[PDB]
Design a protein around this ligand. Structure first.
Ligand SMILES: C=CC1=C(C)/C(=C\c2[nH]c(/C=C3N=C(/C=C4\NC(=O)C(C)=C4C=C)C(C)=C\3CCC(=O)O)c(CCC(=O)O)c2C)NC1=O
Length: 565
């Protein structure tokens, strides 16, 4: 019995939490009570399967059981058992149409938390899982614990708010980043294949554990790949289980992997896993030989490449990565790709060595492009500040791909602008991996949000031609020349002065949702005049809100401000 096996392994509490998450991210629209009901039913069926390991249908796979259960509250269900599952996965909505969740006053939360604790927690997982269908399940358990600790500690102190609100924000943020990072790992596996994912891990783990040996790193990558293959496919229970087995292993071999795995291995399961996943890069091994020796000077290259190209190319990436934590993971993959393309062409020639001898020479432009890009943007950022930098980015992206919907552009550009504060404060040595790998996560968001309802062949081409070159592809785009300006209309922007009650930030989002709309009418409008038409609008909500009158200006000053623009 598979259901029984996972129950004993994970326990009862984690078991219940994981099924809730799996169900919440399969049917994101259904109510809490429905999932809660289905979860308990399943758990009871799991208990009766523990005793009699051959009861009702304790033989059925996790898929079938979970599948039949959801089909009691829902096309997809009219399918059979392999693919009826694939049907569900295909309908996960990355941008669900769900109500903006808002936190009541601290007093209503502490009561709810104190009265029924298990319920207050199940609701956390449900609200988070249904809005982030690819959220890394095992980590959602880790955050749940931290959430519980925020309430347990703060709901007793003096200023509860001054103790809870800050920690719940640090959580919400760390959570969005975690969700984005995981959405990319799932996109790699699902759109590009496990080989693209393994190349990514080999490179990332080699930077983190330079003292590990290719054979050890290769084992780690293999396991990590299964964990993610499973989590990204909805096999939440075996993902959590297998993720525990990997944490166990890594600690039982700290010495053959990394020294900085200390603190990690001296703590709770959930936290140990989290710690290992974010541990800092180890110190680079003593004296490592030159890469040129075994990869460009040697005469066996083409022979080794023929013998086992995959193993050989993995070795190249591992070697180049372990000694370059100053390079972003995608640049490493890019270099590895250039090496591959060269051996493929050179090894088919007469004198191979002479052909692939100056391969490192082709690496030069590849390394310098990202470095110049990070410098140019941190400079702009530093002098303009976040808000202004995001605006500079909004005009740029809207001109690049005018078809994309205003909400996606505004959302994607605001995140792109956060690279400024997230990375520019580091020393040039750690800026690239920080910047480019972060830009990869955000651009992935644009690719998945756009993939649903495509409207731009330019976004589609950059998103699907190559995972590693996504950032450079978008960077090479300029202004869409074939775009035909939008026709202005009334409802273009509901100037309803209900914005005066909105937070200073949602006011910027609305003030940015307008800048996008304008640039769509005046693609050719210079950044100059645009950098002025904003002030003209800031004046609007300014006077209109402070003015003690009806929504007049929202109608009068609004339809009159249009003539002034
Ligand atoms: C009285 C009880 C009660 C509350 C408090 C409630 C609303 C409510 N609003 C929330 C905000 C939210 N919290 C998140 C996200 C996260 N938050 C995280 O801890 C993590 C790890 C993520 C990442 C996925 C989001 C997206 C929202 C709503 C929109 C936003 O502000 O970002 C949350 C999630 C937990 C939190 O961030 O504090 C709840 C439960 N409804 C209720 O009945």
């Amino acid at each position: 019995s598979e259901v029984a096996h996972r129950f004993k392994d994970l326990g009862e509490e984690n078991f219940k939490a994981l099924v809730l998450i799996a169900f919440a991210q399969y049917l994101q629209q259904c109510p809490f009570e429905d999932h809660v009901k289905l979860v308990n039913e399943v758990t009871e069926f799991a208990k009766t399967c523990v005793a009699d390991e051959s009861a009702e249908n304790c033989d059925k796979s996790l898929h079938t059981l979970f599948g039949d259960k959801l089909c009691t509250v829902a096309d997809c269900c009219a399918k059979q058992e392999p693919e009826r599952n694939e049907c569900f996965l295909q309908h996960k909505d990355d941008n669900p149409n769900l109500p903006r969740l808002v936190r009541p006053e601290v007093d209503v939360m502490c009561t709810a938390f104190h009265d029924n604790e298990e319920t207050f927690l199940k609701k956390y997982l449900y609200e988070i899982a249904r809005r982030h269908p690819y959220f890394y399940a095992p980590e959602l358990l880790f955050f749940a614990k931290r959430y519980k600790a925020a309430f347990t500690e703060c709901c007793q102190a003096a200023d509860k708010a001054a103790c809870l609100l800050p920690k719940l924000d640090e959580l919400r943020d760390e959570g969005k980043a975690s969700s984005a990072k995981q959405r990319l790992k799932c996109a790699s596996l699902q759109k590009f294949g496990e080989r693209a994912f393994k190349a990514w891990a080999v490179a990332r783990l080699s930077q983190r554990f330079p003292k590990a040996e290719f054979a050890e790193v290769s084992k780690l990558v293999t396991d990590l790949t299964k964990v993610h293959t499973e989590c990204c496919h909805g096999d939440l229970l075996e993902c959590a289980d297998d993720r525990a087995d990997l944490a166990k292993y890594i600690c039982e071999n700290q010495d053959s992997i990394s020294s900085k795995l200390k603190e990690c291995c001296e703590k709770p399961l959930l936290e140990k896993s989290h710690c290992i996943a974010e541990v800092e890069n180890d110190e680079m091994p003593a004296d490592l030989p030159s890469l040129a020796a075994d990869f460009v000077e040697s005469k066996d290259v083409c022979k080794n490449y023929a013998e086992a190209k995959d193993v050989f190319l993995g070795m190249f990436l591992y070697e180049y990565a372990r000694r370059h934590p100053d390079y972003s993971v995608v640049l490493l993959l890019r270099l590895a790709k250039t090496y591959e393309t060269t051996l493929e062409k050179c090894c088919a020639a007469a004198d191979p060595h002479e052909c692939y001898a100056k391969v490192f020479d082709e690496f030069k432009p590849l390394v310098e492009e990202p470095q110049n890009l990070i410098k140019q943007n941190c400079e702009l950022f530093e002098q303009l500040g976040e808000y202004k930098f995001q605006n500079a980015l909004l005009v740029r992206y809207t001109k690049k791909v005018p078809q994309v919907s205003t909400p996606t552009l505004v959302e994607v550009s605001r995140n792109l602008g956060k690279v400024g504060s997230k990375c520019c404060k580091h020393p040039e040595a750690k800026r690239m991996p920080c910047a480019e790998d972060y830009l990869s996560v955000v651009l992935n968001q644009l690719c998945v949000l756009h993939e649903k309802t495509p409207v731009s062949d330019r976004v589609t081409k950059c998103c699907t031609e190559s995972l590693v070159n996504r950032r450079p592809c978008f960077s090479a785009l300029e202004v869409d020349e074939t775009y035909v300006p939008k026709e202005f209309n009334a409802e273009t922007f509901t100037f309803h002065a209900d914005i005066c009650t909105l937070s200073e930030k949602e006011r910027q989002i609305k003030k940015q949702t307008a800048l996008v709309e304008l640039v769509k009418h005046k693609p050719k409008a210079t950044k100059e005049q645009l950098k002025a038409v904003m002030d003209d609008f800031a004046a609007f909500v300014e006077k209109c809100c402070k003015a003690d009158d009806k929504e007049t200006c929202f109608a009068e000053e609004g339809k009159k401000l249009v003539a002034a623009s």
